Amino acid sequence: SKLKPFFALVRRTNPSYGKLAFALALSVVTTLVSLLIPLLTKQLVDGFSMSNLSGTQIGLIALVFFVQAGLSAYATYALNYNGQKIISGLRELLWKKLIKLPVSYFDTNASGETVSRVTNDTMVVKELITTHISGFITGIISVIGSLTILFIMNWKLTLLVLVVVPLAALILVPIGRKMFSISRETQDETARFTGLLNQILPEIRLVKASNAEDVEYGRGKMGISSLFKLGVREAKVQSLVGPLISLVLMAALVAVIGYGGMQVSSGELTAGALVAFILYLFQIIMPMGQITTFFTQLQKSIGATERMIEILAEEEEDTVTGKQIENAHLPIQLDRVSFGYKPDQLILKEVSAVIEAGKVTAIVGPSGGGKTTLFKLLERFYSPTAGTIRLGDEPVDTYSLESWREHIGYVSQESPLMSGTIRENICYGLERDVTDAEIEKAAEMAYALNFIKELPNQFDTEVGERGIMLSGGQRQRIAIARALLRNPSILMLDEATSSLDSQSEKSVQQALEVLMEGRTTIVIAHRLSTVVDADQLLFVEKGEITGRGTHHELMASHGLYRDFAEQQ
Amino acid sequence: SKLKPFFALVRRTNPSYGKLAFALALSVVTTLVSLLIPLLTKQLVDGFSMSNLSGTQIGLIALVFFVQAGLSAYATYALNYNGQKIISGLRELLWKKLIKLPVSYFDTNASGETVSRVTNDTMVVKELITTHISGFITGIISVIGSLTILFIMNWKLTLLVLVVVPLAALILVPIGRKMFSISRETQDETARFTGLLNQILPEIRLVKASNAEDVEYGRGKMGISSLFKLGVREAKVQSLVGPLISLVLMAALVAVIGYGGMQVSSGELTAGALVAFILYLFQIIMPMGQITTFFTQLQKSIGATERMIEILAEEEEDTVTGKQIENAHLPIQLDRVSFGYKPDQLILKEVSAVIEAGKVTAIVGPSGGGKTTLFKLLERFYSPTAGTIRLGDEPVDTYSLESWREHIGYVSQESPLMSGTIRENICYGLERDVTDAEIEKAAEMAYALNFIKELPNQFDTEVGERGIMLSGGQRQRIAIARALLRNPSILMLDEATSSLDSQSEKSVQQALEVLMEGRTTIVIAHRLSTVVDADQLLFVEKGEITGRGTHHELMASHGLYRDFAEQQ
């Protein structure tokens, strides 16, 4: 059952299984050559009883060490290479998924955690493919192959190892886990004290103004006393754990190596068979660590595969389906539309309005009262739960999101400065073979050109978390230049959520005034005073509405919530 | 030279050196008993040539293992205990230093880094005292004692080990450092990609609005391609490093164990001497790790001692020197006073003013222009560079800071909520044997009592980063209750630096109005509108002054910087 998704996740990378198979095979053949070195050494050590060295025996041991190293090296490369080509394929698939997910995905799921998916979870599967599967398979063959040769070569000394090794681990493992618990307990008390000092030192002015220097000292002195009473328990425990580990491990070693030595002097064994036995003990006790490592890792890695195949399961945003748009200079309408993240818990209910062509229609109201939902529905960031948004005759789901997002233009005042060249940020995603004669003219109209020419180069600069960093009206003008160069029919303007005051007003207000001409403009307001001269203003509260006029017309004709004209 | 401060830092803890000496001694005696186990094993293995076991030989090997473990355990305890008693003493000394440093210490030096001093640096010295010094000393005796017995027992097989062990390390160490460089290079490229995805995913709305989904994918695809071209270099390198480590380590093991085996069959050695030789190889190759560990650690630890003895070198705030105060209901004056952190770079120059008894005197001006320095001088948080602050006749440095800080009362509106009981926060540092009949009455006057009785208990609650958390006018009223219960003559009121708007105004303004009666009140303003009705108002700009009137009197009579009455 449980391993079914892991091979389905690997298969879709086109992994060329013949090359992985061979690499695994060579890993096995290498391990069977490790078992032969101590038998060649037995033949050397026993043969030297006639004490002239047969030079061909020590040459054959060296030749087998070099063949061992060649097959180990090719196998290690082959595993690594093929694993690196799988990880890159998974990366690729997660990336193109991520990049096309509905943007609502990102509301529910933390961006930085998503990135961890791509980066970390892929790594975890790499380790299994490259390292742990081979390590397991080879480890098993090494341990069983060592013990089956040992049992044929001397059974009594093997039975002693099969008693001593688990009887030692039966004593060491309970002791290891108890010792580790006291280490963790001491780290938690150290964090608790560190937190006591970290709260007293920023308060130090009040501590001194109060004459409280003696009482804070007494309370810190209590905190070093609990660290001391805990540290003397760690000292008591570790004084039994330390010498008990040394006693059990050498007593085991003295019993095994010493009983083998007693058989050689007794005549029950040869000096070469003791040399072979000592060489196989490394080939048992060392790859037992890679065996346990496999099980250790598989527990976390299997979760990682479910954690990724999750992602690849998600719905993509279908941008291409439906009609292409023409003549978007038509009245938008919302027709008794609703929205919510559940069928019951509506954020917006049965709302109706028209948004006229070549007109300005501002959106306003109390925070959380519904404004952001009405705007995200018109920006098609969300799809409505019932009713239709319309564009003249047709419901807007008639039209391709790729075509809708070519006719709208988005500008946020709390503007994100994405990393790149100052020109590329003015034609971002605008695949039209654009020339600097046009890019300059868009920067002119945006009142950016005179500032751009002030930067280190006449028309280049790198910006973002790298290069030049820009504030307020400098980033906002290159955004208005991007908007201007795209030629939108509908403009969708997002005021600052963090509620900053506007900067260098005369330039950015003039840049907007040239962007807005002839454009159907929808704007969402975080303070009411920024939109008061609009042709139409919409007031949204508790997922319902009352505003359907210009500001002074509504303030005269309706006035049921005059308070928001006082709070502003 | 370099170790001189380390023993001076340890000595002042009163470390009872006789007990450390003995513990070290027992560590040595234990190590000399480790060297005897393989000689008793040699005698057993050689004696079994007449193949009836002398039961007293295997009893004597067991008795020496139990004496070894007893002396190891007592020594390990003794080192740990004594080390735990040193660390607690250092902790104690750093703490009482820290707690009494001039508060200006905390402007220059980061609080959280200071805490690290206490916590981490002390730990580093503990490891040296408990673990590393003994480890070194014992390690040396173990390695030299093993090699001197080996050279007496069989010299030829010792010379082979003295050639093979360094010739192996001469090949493995350059290879280890090259491999580690490629591991670090791959971690830095992984961080660079993770940073590329982490900047594109929060921008995803702009990516989708722009139709930029294809270009962002292409740029992420470039980032997985550089990770692939780097990972296939790590694969090339590791395919040579992996099998070369296995080749050199077993070829060394086959040469040493195999040449020893050839001497036993040749007649140049006995089976028991080979068993002793194999048992000493663990006692050489294992404590070489603790030797290198010592040097590794000492490099960081010696720095740690200079890093602490630093601290203990600092000037303490002398709170006790000079006169005690009586009748502080006298005009404060500043007499041609100055301040700065350097003799040249004055923050305040030759300023003169009187602050009348039973009067209110507010401090105002542009940010960074000098206001905070004039206030911190009156709060005696700083000492003036020239001239004197005075209290009636005498310069204020006549009086004990412990007595001055009993006659002033400090209240900050951006109030720190220090951790503790809701009653103890109202009598913090007020050592007078106070009773709940008084604490209640102070909470009444502060308009806190009616809120306190609303909490989970009638007059208890734990507060801080634990228990109940309180906002604005709730924490401010227990601060005004503390101020009220102390009976200040001078009140020193600090408005919010983060420029928050005031909350539940009618209660806190009434609480202040009852605190302020008959009190000489000095207040520092972050907005001018909060202090306009004061008896006196002081305007501070560029480290000089012009305001010396009440608000409307100054605004009429002077007006040289009317702009701050417009900016407010």
Author numbering:
A (entry chain A), B (entry chain B): 10 to 577
Publication passage describing the model:
In order to rule out the possibility that the disulfide bond restrained a wider opening of BmrA, we also determined by cryo-EM the structure of the WT protein in the resting state at a resolution of 3.16 Å. The C-terminal domain of the transporter appears more flexible than the rest of the protein, and residues 578 onward could not be modeled. And on Movie S1, the structure of WT BmrA is highly similar to that of the A582C cross-linked mutant (rmsd of 0.86 Å over 931 residues). However this difference is minimal and represents only 1.4 to 2.2 Å when comparing the Cα position of residues K351, K380, Q483, and H535 from the NBD conserved motifs (A-loop, Walker A motif, ABC signature, and H-loop, respectively) between the WT and the mutant proteins. In the absence of ligand, the distance between the spins was outside of measurable range (>60 Å), consistent with the BmrA IF cryo-EM structure where the Cα of the two cysteines are separated by 65 Å. By generating a molecular morph between the IF and OF conformations of WT BmrA, we found that the NBDs of the transporter can function according to a tweezers-like motion. In comparison, the NBDs of BmrA monomers are well aligned and dimerize in a single translation. Finally, we solved the first IF structure of BmrA, providing not only a structural framework for further experimental studies but also complementing the previously published OF structures of BmrA to further understand the molecular details of the alternating access transport mechanism.
pmcATP-binding cassette (ABC) transporters are ubiquitous membrane proteins that couple the energy of ATP binding and hydrolysis to the translocation of a wide variety of molecules across biological membranes. Here, we investigated whether a large separation of the nucleotide-binding domains is required for the transport cycle of BmrA, a homodimeric multidrug ABC transporter from Bacillus subtilis. Upon ATP binding, the NBDs engage in a transient tight dimer where the two nucleotides are sandwiched between the Walker A motif from one NBD and the ABC signature motif from the other NBD, thereby generating the OF conformation that is prone to drug release. Overall, our data suggest that the NBDs of BmrA function with a tweezers-like mechanism distinct from the related lipid A exporter MsbA.
